[PDB]
Design a protein around this ligand. Structure first.
Ligand code: IM2
Length: 260
């Protein structure tokens, strides 16, 4: 089982972490599934989930307009930047955070939740004890070896995604909104999506720290007429200038799906 992944992570020059779960059969694949990896932008899926969970207690939260100044803008905010003159609702910021990895939107939503500690508190509320977000955009992307900040494990990411997209953690309408946002993600076509047949529905959230060969993807997959699959592929590398590889993420994802 682990043999194909070790092979892959030695063509890549760094570490690959993989965890996949068949929700019907209960079969799993694990490879470095309990090691910590930098979240990079991938926490933004759970951010949107946390915002949805809070809207269950705070009616009208999703429609709340957030009017921000030019100061709220940080690099890689392609949606947020376009609406500087009108603002965006919490729901619009959430879709932007998920589907375009919009950094200003994420910081705005983090603020709504009480900062990185607020998001970590939400992940604890659903029983995730591994996840930790400690910093804001963009410092959380530093991905320095040995730093436990802003990390989780492939297994913890998979279990939390499972609880949120298929389980009871979100109420029924919020749960479908979360799934819909992941399904409409625009940044992951070359990662986990590239490993499934095009006739299978996929929702995913990517992460790309830009340094230390650190990039990732987690996804829910619906095989046609089949129980849904949940999986996470995370990578890192020892040298700051080591390049991440979308191909390696897709190859790792295919090995996980061909192995369940
Ligand atoms: C998140 O990981 C980073 C961080 C700088 O906020 C941004 C950069 C990118 S943009 C395209 C990356 N390539 C493939 N996805 C994303 C991202 O979508 O991963 N988030």
């Amino acid at each position: 089982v682990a043999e194909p992944f070790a092979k892959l992570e030695q063509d890549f020059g760094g570490s690959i972490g993989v965890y996949a779960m068949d929700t019907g059969s209960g079969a799993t694949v694990s490879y470095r599934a309990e090691e910590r990896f930098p979240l990079c932008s991938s926490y933004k899926g759970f951010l949107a989930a946390a915002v949805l969970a809070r809207s269950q207690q705070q009616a009208g939260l999703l429609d709340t307009p957030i009017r921000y100044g030019k100061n709220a803008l940080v690099p890689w905010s392609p949606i947020s930047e376009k609406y500087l003159t009108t603002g965006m609702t919490v729901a619009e910021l959430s879709a932007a955070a998920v589907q375009y990895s919009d950094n200003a939107a994420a910081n705005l939503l983090l603020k709504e939740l009480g900062g990185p500690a607020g998001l970590t508190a939400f992940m604890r509320s659903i029983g995730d004890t591994t996840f930790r977000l400690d910093r804001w955009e963009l410092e959380l992307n530093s991905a320095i070896p040995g730093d436990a900040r802003d990390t989780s494990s492939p297994r913890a990411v998979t279990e939390s995604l499972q609880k949120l997209t298929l389980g009871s953690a979100l109420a029924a309408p919020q749960r479908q909104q979360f799934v819909d946002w992941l399904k409409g993600n625009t940044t992951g076509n070359h990662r986990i999506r590239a490993a499934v047949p095009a006739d299978w529905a996929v929702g995913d959230k990517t992460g790309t720290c830009g340094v230390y060969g650190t990039a990732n993807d987690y996804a829910v997959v619906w095989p046609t007429g089949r129980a849904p699959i949940v999986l996470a592929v995370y990578t890192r590398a020892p040298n700051k200038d080591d390049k991440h590889s979308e191909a390696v993420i897709a190859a790792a994802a295919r090995l996980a799906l061909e192995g369940l």
